[PDB]
């Protein structure tokens, strides 16, 4: 207590004003570890610390308290929150959940993301001054004034410390002034002094007429000494419930004294830990558990605007990603230009131009798929957490993501299409160049939407990548350049009818060979099926395919959960 920092402010600048929140659980019995006869009652102003086996597999106790859970879902007890039965609406309106893994954008500062969360949480009735005052009070409450302008970047970036990241996450989850606070392993991977400061901050937050629940596996001595209420959970069954300072006295009174120079929590955890020997230690924990019972707004448009602004601010500040994207785009453009260099004494032939167009059409989709899959899986967990928190109903989020990707997509298209039309010595003019540019832009946009749908459809990164590669190979083989687009009986014909690469190649052929007769244009278009659809028909088909892919992506976002 005397070895840690003592120059702090014990004042509370942002307290909870309202009725005291209550959380009462009566005979909780979870099934698929082995929670049997769990019952506790906490009120506002007390800090409940769940030590020991605070999990039931992949989901912790705080997850089943809030109603979540990755394992089973059958229940056998009752959960009373503020005098009302458990329900998703109540846990979403009153209960706040702070996960172990943070969800913060590295390209944003603390103040920016705090203002964004405040705008997405507070209703439309609150003016900008009220939101600014709330943000300032949240910053001053957690003592984040010395890092309000510094970035919150994760590893591989400067950012800030881990404790400051946890404080920023707490402020994000505490902006809408919740009544019940819940954190899952807040001091995981932090420094000892940092963990002590975080525990002191959580205790000060709980002291301001609030309810804070902490789940820790192996708490330290200084962490256990500051606990207000403690609940010993070993293999799902509770052993002790009350003050932390009285746990040693209760264990001495029940006939289990704590040895000198030994942590009480660790000793009481490893004393009743289950291992012939498994059944001998099971009756010991059940005897202590059985005896313990005998002694006792703002709107869709506003949310879309906030989301697109946050996405733009996060994308325009990612220097290495944009730099590597531009570098690879320039490399591909220079390769395409210098490989099919038409300027000189010898000009390009028909097969050379056809191969050049086919490569321009079917080389960028691979890198596009890779980049979109990476960008989707770098924030799938954050998106799932934001959807579970109850900010938006993923209605305008689709349009927000589309309008945030559109600038980067257009920039990449420009960078890839500038040094490729003049170096290859194609058909001169402005209208054919603009048509080729628009066709390439639409094809790459359709490929991006397909990648988004494939990422949102499959939760596994490797499985989604394999499915995207399979679709890319199916659309590549369906082109009118490899299998002549004539040897398709029933399946490849219908595959090419919906393959954007085939339509792209057909449009490029019809644009570059429009009334052109070269020595050894109309004959090759007659012998192939490229003349069966005019240019505007190809454009309409591409637009329809893009719309269908967007509809599929929206359906996958609305129905399929984005479980990490």
């Amino acid at each position, epitope marked *: 207590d005397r070895l840690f920092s003592s*120059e702090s402010d014990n*004042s*509370l600048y942002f307290t909870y004003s309202g009725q005291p929140n209550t959380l009462e659980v009566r005979d909780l019995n979870y099934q698929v570890l082995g929670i049997q006869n769990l019952s506790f009652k906490v009120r506002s102003g007390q800090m409940l610390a769940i030590i020991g086996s605070s999990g039931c597999g992949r989901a912790s106790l705080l997850d089943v308290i809030t109603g979540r859970g990755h394992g089973g879902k059958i229940k056998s007890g009752q959960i009373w929150i503020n005098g009302q039965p458990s329900s998703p609406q109540l846990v979403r309106k009153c209960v706040a959940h702070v996960r172990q893994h943070n969800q913060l954008l590295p390209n944003l500062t603390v103040r920016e993301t705090l203002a964004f969360i405040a705008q997405m949480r507070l209703p439309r009735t609150f003016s900008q001054a009220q939101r600014d005052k709330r943000v300032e009070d949240v910053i001053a409450e957690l003592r984040l*004034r010395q890092c309000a302008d510094t970035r919150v970047g994760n590893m591989y970036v400067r950012g800030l410390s881990g404790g400051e990241r946890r404080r920023v996450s707490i402020g994000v989850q505490l902006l809408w002034n919740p009544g019940i606070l819940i954190l899952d392993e807040p001091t995981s991977g932090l420094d000892s002094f940092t963990a002590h400061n975080l525990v002191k901050t959580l205790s000060r937050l709980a002291k301001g007429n609030r309810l804070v629940l902490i789940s820790l596996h192996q708490p330290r001595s200084d962490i256990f000494r500051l606990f207000d209420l403690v609940l010993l959970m070993t293999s799902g069954t509770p052993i002790y419930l009350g003050a932390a300072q009285h746990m040693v006295q209760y264990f001495t009174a029940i006939g289990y004294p704590c040895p000198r120079y030994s942590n009480p929590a660790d000793f009481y955890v490893d004393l009743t830990s289950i291992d012939e020997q498994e059944l001998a230690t099971r009756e010991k924990a059940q005897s202590l558990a059985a005896l313990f019972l005998e002694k006792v707004m703002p709107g869709a448009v506003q949310q879309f605007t906030t989301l697109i602004r946050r996405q733009i601010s996060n994308d325009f500040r990612d220097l290495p990603t944009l730099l590597e994207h531009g570098a690879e785009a320039c490399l591909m453009s220079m390769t395409i230009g210098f490989l099919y260099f038409g300027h000189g004494s010898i000009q390009l032939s028909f097969m050379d131009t056809a191969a050049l167009l086919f490569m321009i059409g079917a080389l960028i989709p691979f890198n596009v798929i890779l980049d979109v899959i990476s960008k989707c899986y770098s924030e799938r967990a954050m998106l799932y957490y934001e959807l579970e928190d109850g900010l938006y109903t993923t209605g305008p989020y689709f349009f927000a993501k589309i309008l945030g990707e559109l600038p980067e997509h257009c920039a990449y298209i420009i960078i890839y299409g500038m040094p490729t039309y003049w170096l290859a010595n194609l058909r001169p003019g402005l209208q054919p160049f603009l048509l080729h540019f628009l066709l390439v832009w639409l094809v790459v946009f359709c490929c991006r939407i397909m990648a988004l749908a494939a990422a949102a459809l499959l939760p596994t990164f490797h499985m989604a990548s394999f499915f995207s590669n399979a679709l890319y190979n199916s659309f590549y083989l369906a082109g009118g350049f490899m299998i002549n687009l004539s040897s398709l009986w029933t399946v490849p014909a219908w595959i090419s009818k919906v393959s954007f690469l085939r339509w792209c190649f057909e449009g490029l052929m019809k644009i570059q060979f429009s009334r052109r007769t070269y020595k050894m244009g109309d004959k090759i278009l007659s012998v192939m099926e490229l003349d069966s659809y005019p240019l505007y028909a190809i454009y309409l088909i591409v637009i329809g395919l893009s719309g269908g892919f967007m509809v599929l992506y929206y359906v996958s976002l609305r129905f399929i959960k984005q479980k990490p």
Partner: antibody
Amino acid sequence: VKLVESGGGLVQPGGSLRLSCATSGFTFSEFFMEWVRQPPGKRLEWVAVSRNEANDYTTDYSASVKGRFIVSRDTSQNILYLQMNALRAEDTAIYYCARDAWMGFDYWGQGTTV
Amino acid sequence: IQMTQSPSSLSASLGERVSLTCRASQEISGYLSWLQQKPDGTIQRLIYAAFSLDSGVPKRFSGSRSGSDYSLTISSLESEDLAHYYCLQYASYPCTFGGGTKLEI
């Protein structure tokens, strides 16, 4: 918002004196209460702070006067009090009565010579 | 956090643009306030957060920031500006003040 300081006079070293800070024009049970002094030849120095009702009217002092000064507030009359013990040695200043510190020192008082 | 305000004294006539410099020992992220102690004794805050102004404060007072050095620029000075200025920080506990600047006509 108006702040009026009172209780200044000539005292002996080791005696006792109590200052009065009148509050008017704002809610006394919703805002903080700060005590800032000023030596005749030095800069401003924060002395103590009186928290609002949300903090159970807890008090806090600086590392230089911790244990000798006692600050209290009257909710019925909206008057702040500061009990000063072992003064006239170095605590002689032009003590002012401030309202808020975390939100910027605004709406200062008049100040009296102790 | 030590607040070093420069210069210790400044003398100018009416109509010139005066600027006071205040440097913080650590990073406050723009949490700085400016005070005005009149010779009579009544102190009044002029600029808070180094960017905004209080109620009843004339528009001649402005605040700027250049890296880690905060500047209080006062243009079109009148005779009613003869007072002391103290810069303070409230981003880290405890709140410390500056050295001060005696602005005289």
